[PDB]
Design a protein around this ligand. Sequence first.
Ligand code: CDL
Ligand code: CDL
Ligand code: PLX
Ligand code: PEE
Lengths: 347, 122, 83, 140, 175, 115, 171, 98, 105
Amino acid sequence: MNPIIYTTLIMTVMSGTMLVMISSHWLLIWIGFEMNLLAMIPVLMKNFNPRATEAATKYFLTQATASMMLMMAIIINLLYSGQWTITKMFNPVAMTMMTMALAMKLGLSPFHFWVPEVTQGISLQAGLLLLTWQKLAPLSVLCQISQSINPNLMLTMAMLSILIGGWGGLNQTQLRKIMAYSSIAHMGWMTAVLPYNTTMTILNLLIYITMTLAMFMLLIHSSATTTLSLSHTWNKMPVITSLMMVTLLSMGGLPPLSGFMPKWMIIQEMTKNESIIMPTLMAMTALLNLYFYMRLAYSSSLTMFPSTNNMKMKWQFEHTKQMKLLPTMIVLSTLVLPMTPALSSLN
Amino acid sequence: MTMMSGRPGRVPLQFLPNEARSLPPPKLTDPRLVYMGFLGYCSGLIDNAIRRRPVVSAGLHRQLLYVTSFVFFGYYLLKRQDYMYALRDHDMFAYVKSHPEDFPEKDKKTYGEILEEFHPVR
Amino acid sequence: AGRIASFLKNAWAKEPVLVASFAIGGLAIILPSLSPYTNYAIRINRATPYNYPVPLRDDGNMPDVPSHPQDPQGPSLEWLKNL
Amino acid sequence: AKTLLHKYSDIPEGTECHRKAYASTSIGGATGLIVSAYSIALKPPASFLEGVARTGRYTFTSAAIGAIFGLTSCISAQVREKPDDPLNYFIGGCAGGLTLGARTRSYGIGAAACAYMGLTAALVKMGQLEGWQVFAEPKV
Amino acid sequence: MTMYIAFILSTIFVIGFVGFSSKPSPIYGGLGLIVSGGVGCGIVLNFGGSFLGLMVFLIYLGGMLVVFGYTTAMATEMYPEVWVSNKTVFGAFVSGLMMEFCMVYYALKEEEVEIIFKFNGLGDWVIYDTGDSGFFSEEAMGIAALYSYGTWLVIVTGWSLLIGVVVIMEITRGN
Amino acid sequence: MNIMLTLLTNVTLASLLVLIAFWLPQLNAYSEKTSPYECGFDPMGSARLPFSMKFFLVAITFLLFDLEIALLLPLPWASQTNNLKTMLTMALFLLILLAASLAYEWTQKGLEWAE
Amino acid sequence: PGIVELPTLEDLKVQEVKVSSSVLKAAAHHYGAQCDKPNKEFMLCRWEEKDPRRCLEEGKLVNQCALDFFRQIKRHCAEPFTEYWTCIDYSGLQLFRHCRKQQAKFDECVLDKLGWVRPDLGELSKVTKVKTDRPLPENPYHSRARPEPNPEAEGDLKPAKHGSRLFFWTM
Amino acid sequence: MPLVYMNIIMAFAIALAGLLMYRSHLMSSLLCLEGMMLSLFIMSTLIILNTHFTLANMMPIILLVFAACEAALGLSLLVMVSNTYGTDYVQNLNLLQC
Amino acid sequence: PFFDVQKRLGLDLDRWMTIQSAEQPHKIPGRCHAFEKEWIECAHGIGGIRAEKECKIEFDDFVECLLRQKTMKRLSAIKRQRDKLIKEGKYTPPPHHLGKEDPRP
Ligand SMILES: CCCCCCCCCCCCCCCCCC(=O)OC[C@H](COP(=O)([O-])OCC(O)COP(=O)([O-])OC[C@@H](COC(=O)CCCCCCCCCCCCCCCCC)OC(=O)CCCCCCCCCCCCCCCCC)OC(=O)CCCCCCCCCCCCCCCCC
Ligand SMILES: CCCCCCCCCCCCCCCCCC(=O)OC[C@H](COP(=O)([O-])OCC(O)COP(=O)([O-])OC[C@@H](COC(=O)CCCCCCCCCCCCCCCCC)OC(=O)CCCCCCCCCCCCCCCCC)OC(=O)CCCCCCCCCCCCCCCCC
Ligand SMILES: CCCCCCCCCCCCCCCCC[C@@H](O)O[C@H](CO[C@H](O)CCCCCCCCCCCCCCC)COP(=O)(O)OCC[N+](C)(C)C
Ligand SMILES: CCCCCCCC/C=C/CCCCCCCC(=O)OC[C@H](COP(=O)(O)OCCN)OC(=O)CCCCCCC/C=C/CCCCCCCC
């Protein structure tokens, strides 16, 4: 692919997301989604091979079905109230269809199956984009229509997402599928607090995005897509594996690391309403994500796996391309808890 | 739920309303600013470590820029956070003042007139 | 200024269709900004009375509004008859 | 739907045990039907008759568990003359767990299901007594 | 009640939808979609939407021509399936027909809420306008307002079409 | 009403012509007469086998260019607005975008058929 | 929700203008020149009251003015008007352009007999002013009293008491 | 709602069910997607015409445009799939699991 | 979530098409212009929570104009009673209803 064409496609993806974020008209929001998908399909196919083509096809089918349901919900809402402005969604059937369409776009359970497959079928850069930038538009719409949400449906989907993310991640040796299941669980956490406080949703999204960016950038720096290939990195660059171990611990939600901050905050918010059983269940379930993060840390940093002879040659060369934002991303992923009250600036 | 998005008079993308100028600014020795500078210094050290350069001595200009940028952003972040908390307190006090029926000050009782059950430990 | 003349000659000798298309498109783009009759077209469009003209209530302080269709006040279409 | 839930919950605890057992059986049957639908969708049974067999097996298991739970809980509440007591729900849950164990023909499944279902049913009864909310409506 | 023309056209619309949704073979699916496009054009015409009906008919005719070519190229087999050549396709078709007939009977003999709300019938003539004015077509004016009011829509639409050309070329480049 | 009657009349006339064609003459159909025609020799394969399309990219581009026709059709009515400058700017913008898309597909060998 | 007030049938009776569309079109310009005042009064009533039940007398006056206009036209130029409207009526689109001789004869007759001048192009489409004693309605939409807004934000902004007050943080 | 509205909604539901239930050909599912788009066009046009929402009359045309884009996208992907397998069966898209 | 770029810059990217009571070409009015105008003026500035209760009457009138459910219910009741009366034979329906009416322009 031409670099000019790649830049144009990335800019079109971002423009579709921005159009979703700045629009007041439902038609313009739908157009933003369409433009984002149209530009996103070729980016997933940048390195051409059958797996990338399969991932792109599955992604297109899922997102096109979601957009059809989105448009039908908009039209039903218009039928029962001649309104185009994104507001309290005057019809409940239309609101149910809207919620299901947005959940399918986000990959929330039980519309979760496509996320591990698409993530595994594409490159690490495409996976970074898909798991970070592609969450902004549906979450922005959900934040805008939160007051009309049905808490039962969204809470059911969020709890299912957390459970399924943990259970599915428990079974993986491929790093991209691990990241996808982690994303599913974190989306569940984000949507669990949405009917109560959208500021907490934004805070969780920001912290998750920072940690995911650090994770994907560390995985690109050490060209590993499997557990066994990541188990070699200690014999080439131990600093990368140590930073990865601390980042995994933060993603597990352990204090005093930054990944503990959202869950903590969310739990507190849920106890400001009554909502006692659900946060307890959510934390006990997030223990599963912590377990498979810890297994990855065992494989890559806390023990030393056997290496190969040809690795000696790799000792003689340095990394050519350097990521300028990786150190700041790591620091923000780990040492940010003491600045928790700054979340007031989010609302 | 969104508490403060529809608060009347809010300018969409301001980040710092003019009213916030009536609040005392954070001191330059604020411990939160010191921690932000510490975060910048840690970022510089990690940058040195990843690039296989001497961690403490490699780039002093780069480390200085890291610390300066973190402090510069942290100052305005702290200003906005303090403004938001001041706004919350202002609205809470005004609402309590305008709805006295929902916030009554009931008569005070001393502990010599309050009957509390005693539970012996044995 | 000399190489572009050769380029134009070569284009006219090899792809006259594209030369004519580009010339016509450029003329269509740039000419309307230089014509004095575009505003005449705007005025003609504005002078077409699709809807009924609802009369205004006389408060006694509108000397620019006619009291009858044939009164000298109000807009004139005499420019349109000479076009 | 919530119609079945209301049909079960409208009857008082230690009264009309047959009707409560019927309502619990209906709830269990609906749950088993949904489970079988998802199972057939995600794991095709290679034959239509095999799919019918799996649906019937799952639905009968669920309906039997529900019927046993409802009958045992109501009978315990009526015999002890102690409604609003989580012990009746615990006994019903263990009876349902033993029914599941017999249905799958496994002693470990029976014991684990007795313990866990009894505990869960007692917790549900405590929630009804104290007003615990699973899906809390937004308040603040 | 008046000639049932709109109801008949909408029923044929649903029938064509069932025809292509049972998925016999993309040739016959395209035929069913063409039939649906024609009856939808008729339905929209009966409400005063001449331009929109004609436009949607033309667009779907072009789309189905391209789909026919692609079916000949990439979606064929030795024995293409029709609605009576396979038990799955026939079952889906008959189920769709029976569902449509049951819904029609339910909403016509009774007045009950299928999913959203209730409906009694009376023909679609009741909710018309009796509006008496105009030397122009209102739909034409609204559609023509795209070039004076809908500048933003024109911008985003043109950008999307250019991006679509670039996108299809990138996708089919291969390598 | 009149258009429906016209359509019914035309379809009925065509159907009656087909009916007359199939029921008036004498029919003698046998297996060799109704066999597929391939210039006197039996075909090797089936006509239902995949037939390669060498101009598939042009077909997709035709799908995309067909919608610009729907976009540009209301121009006779759009030419009657009071703000003619905005309308002319937007119509020329759309036509320039279409020409740019054609030029892009042309220069990248997109109009050449596959070999 | 209350009953709807409707005029009686007897109140709706008026002498009718029973000439076809071609006849009306042939005399449209002179009709708009002569009967302008009652028509403008009726249109102002119609657009201000937003209720057809409140402008019935104005409609009756409009009918009376049209009847007087057509009575005069019959009294002075029966034949030229008949020829002109027959010419207009033959056309399928009822076009003015195809019959100018008959229009010229009718115009000459009305000018000489009644001193009537055909309006120039663009004069009948003017926005005019009308003097009426009808009071301007105050609530033509029958609107309810609007709900009162949330009061306001007032006072000077002071720092939050004891800071954020979030768990252990003292700032 | 009139009977016509229910008929159009039923058509949309039928097309959605047809899309969600794959048989073998990707082309048939793409046809179901196009049918859903057509049903949405008809429903929106009927609503906009009924309420005399003049400026909304341009909305259905916009829908069609993006429908075409979506239609083109799908076809492009199908080409690649066919070039990999010689067929457009959804059974062949099974290299990636959960 | 929502960055109100239009409000900050005063651009009006899409607000012209959000409601039916907003500046149509040639001043063509929507079928329910007055009802929507009244509901909007009622609900302006008080927030969604208060508007959902205090502007329920205007919204109900607007929805009745949009979908006309009660009007069809009333018409169906009248028609059913008339049909029963004629079937019993006591209706004695008028000439104007039967098409024998003396039309007026
Ligand atoms: C809570 C209170 C405050 C605490 C704050 C939080 C903690 C401290 C801040 C954290 C960040 C700071 C450092 C970041 C960069 C470090 C990266 C690194 O590689 O270090 C190597 C570097 C040595 O490299 P070198 O000198 O170039 O030559 C040696 C070779 O490079 C040889 O290098 P090599 O690569 O060949 O060696 C391989 C080695 C290389 O691997 C490593 O070195 C690991 C480093 C990972 C960085 C930490 C991750 C990100 C930060 C998150 C920390 C979370 C803390 C919360 C608690 C949870 C714990 C995880 O890997 C291994 O051997 C595998 C060991 C497996 C164990 C896995 C455990 C790792 C996680 C532990 C993290 C604990 C915190 C940091 C510990 C100190 C690190 C220096 O260490 C340093 O010398 C820098 C540290 C000291 C500088 C600061 C001193 C300031 C100036 C002095 C005056 C003080 C002023 C006071 C004012 C008053 C005036 C008088
Ligand atoms: C921190 C401190 C420590 C804390 C934790 C440490 C202590 C707790 C954990 C350790 C003990 C827990 C183990 C639980 C049961 C484990 C079974 C198992 O793992 O299954 C897999 C394992 C795998 O087997 P499989 O693969 O499915 O098939 C092959 C079979 O093995 C082949 O089977 P088979 O053909 O050889 O024969 C099996 C057959 C027959 O088995 C035989 O052939 C030999 C006969 C043995 C049965 C003994 C029953 C009659 C004697 C009991 C006398 C009274 C009990 C003592 C209390 C006196 C009170 C003053 O058994 C049955 O048919 C079951 C029918 C039920 C009758 C027994 C159940 C009575 C429950 C106790 C009620 C107590 C209520 C509270 C009382 C309060 C006052 C103190 O199953 C077995 O092999 C064992 C089967 C028999 C086990 C049942 C014995 C119950 C033991 C007492 C339970 C109390 C703890 C739980 C209470 C809380 C629950 C709410
Ligand atoms: C894991 C660490 C998280 C860090 C996340 C990235 C940090 C660096 C990014 C820098 C942000 C640049 C923004 C500054 C330019 C001004 C933009 C300004 O106009 O935006 C305002 C918005 O301000 C921003 O939201 C503030 C950004 C600051 C975020 C930091 C809070 C993180 C939580 C505490 C963790 C400690 C952070 C430590 C920092 C290094 C407008 O508000 P508004 O248009 O009405 O909001 C729209 C959305 N609403 C209405 C639905 C709410
Ligand atoms: C008095 C001076 C007149 C000035 C007129 C204006 C400038 C005229 C010259 C501008 C460019 C003229 C044509 C381009 C140069 C010559 C053609 C060329 O580049 O190579 C030909 C080659 C075609 O030949 P092949 O198909 O490759 O042959 C294969 C078999 N051998 O051209 C190309 O590769 C690309 C052609 C792109 C065509 C552009 C698409 C259509 C655009 C025109 C529509 C209207 C445009 C109006 C808007 C623009 C306003 C300024």
